[PDB]
Design a protein around this ligand. Structure first.
Ligand code: HEM
Ligand SMILES: CC1=CC[C@@H](C(C)(C)O)CC1
Ligand SMILES: CC1=CC[C@@H](C(C)(C)O)CC1
Length: 418
């Protein structure tokens, strides 16, 4: 048990473990204490590696923008306990990355693979999806309106539109919805068999998904389209096609990254608006505010609770001596309530501007999908809000108990139709 750990065990447990993330009033006060008293310090709790907890907005940016010093590739970029990490390595040829996605990479590899789609995901390219996104948003709004004034905003509505959007961006047909839900909800969901058994199911299931995706790769090499599958399928590096393992990991990364985060942030927006009806009234009388509503939903929800980095050299941050090999947890939620940046950060306020939140991260790995996420949420709220006279919560929201991709999973609401 590492001599440098100074974070009290009860605080360290609260910020590291998955369970506390199910309650805002458990997690945020723990980060507040850290920001006030031990803004960048080391924690070591049973079953986890020792790790620095980056709680300050400044620090999360400084770390995120220096991938040559603070690595995604060297350790697990995801916060696993040791048993889970060991399992992951045992099914991944010793690597602490289950697939070859962008978040598993460091420059220059990372730069090359990110660069394959970087232009596609810029605003002017994404803007062309507007009409498709708007049709998809209207269908989800219609799903909600088919209820007689009562539903679960997540499971009856917000679960769907962001998956359809990622599907449209990839090129996956609408009829493959069941398969895509299995992908993001079952196979890569959080689950709140011996070891050899779970390993067998994993290898068999990922092969099934990769075989499915390969069919698209092949198809798009003969019949190109303006989708991401086609872009990746027809991409070359050093005069050759990209290996299937990178292509298929890219498809998976796009679907998994872009589904829950967007859905959860949408749920957060609904929670904010239900607790602050004056803001619903404002977004409805001034639709030009919706982009600020969207950014506030992402700040306040912060569905991505963490990513990890490993220090590749001895170095200094906020006066602390970070040593080669030390792991660091980046807390986007804590950065997003940093009092040095935001006033009254616990308040949901759609007028907040500027809104320099880290819900999409910062630096070399900053969310590839951010522009698509902002566009689709904007369009969704543009279509939903005129249709609602009022919305309120009918009971407590249920948040995912995870230290990774969390936020609202169930948001029971009542509403009146406009
Ligand atoms: C509100 C919705 C979303 C949130 C909060 C979110 C958040 C994040 C965050 C925090 C990261 C890590 C950034 C870092 O290390 O600095 C990330 C990476 C990524 N996100 Fe998003 N995301 C969202 C929507 C999407 C969408 C719609 C896509 C669709 C393509 C997407 C694709 C990605 C990819 C591919 C990466 C890895 C990029 C890399 O490693 O270079 N995300 N996202
Ligand atoms: C490896 C993996 C971890 C998280 C998954 C989730 C829950 C975000 O879909 C996506 C992919
Ligand atoms: C937000 C996000 C969740 C999953 C990551 C992974 C593990 C697919 O690279 C990509 C980015």
């Amino acid at each position: 048990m590492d001599a440098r750990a100074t974070i009290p065990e009860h605080i360290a447990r609260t910020v590291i473990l998955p369970q506390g993330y199910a309650d805002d009033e458990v997690i945020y006060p723990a980060f507040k204490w850290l920001r006030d008293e031990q803004p960048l310090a080391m924690a070591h709790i049973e079953g986890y590696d020792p790790m620095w907890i980056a709680t300050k907005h400044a620090d999360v940016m400084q770390i995120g923008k220096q991938p040559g010093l603070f690595s995604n590739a060297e350790g697990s970029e995801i916060l696993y306990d040791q048993n889970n990490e060991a399992f992951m390595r045992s099914i991944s040829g010793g690597c602490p990355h289950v697939i070859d996605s962008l978040t598993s990479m460091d420059p220059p590899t990372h730069t090359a693979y990110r660069g394959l789609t970087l232009n596609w995901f810029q605003p002017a390219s994404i803007r062309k999806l507007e009409e498709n996104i708007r049709r998809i948003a209207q269908a989800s709004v219609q799903r909600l309106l088919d209820f007689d004034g009562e539903c679960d905003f997540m499971t009856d509505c917000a679960l769907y539109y962001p998956l359809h959007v990622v599907m449209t961006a990839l090129g996956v047909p609408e009829d493959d919805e069941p398969l895509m839900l299995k992908l993001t909800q079952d196979f890569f969901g959080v689950h709140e068999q011996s070891a050899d058994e779970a390993a067998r199911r994993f290898h068999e299931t990922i092969a099934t998904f990769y075989d499915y995706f390969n069919g698209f790769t092949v198809d798009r090499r003969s019949c190109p389209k303006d989708d991401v599958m086609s872009l990746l399928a027809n991409s070359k590096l050093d005069g050759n096609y990209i290996d299937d393992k990178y292509i298929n990991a890219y498809y998976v990364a796009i679907a998994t990254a872009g589904h829950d985060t967007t859905s959860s942030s949408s749920g957060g927006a609904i929670i904010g608006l239900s607790r602050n009806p004056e803001q619903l009234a404002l977004a409805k009388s001034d639709p030009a505010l919706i982009p600020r509503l969207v950014d506030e939903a992402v700040r306040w929800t912060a569905p991505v609770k963490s990513f990890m980095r490993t220090a590749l050299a001895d170095t200094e941050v906020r006066g602390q001596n970070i040593k080669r090999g030390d792991r660091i947890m980046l807390s986007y939620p804590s950065a997003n309530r940093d009092e040095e940046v935001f006033s009254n950060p616990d308040e949901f306020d759609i007028t907040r501007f500027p809104n320099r939140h880290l819900g999409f991260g910062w630096g070399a790995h900053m969310c590839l999908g951010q522009h698509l996420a902002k566009l689709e949420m904007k369009i969704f709220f543009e279509e939903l809000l005129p249709k609602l006279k009022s919305v309120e919560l009918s009971g407590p929201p249920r948040l995912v108990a995870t230290n990774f991709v969390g936020g609202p999973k169930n948001v029971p609401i009542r509403f009146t139709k406009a």
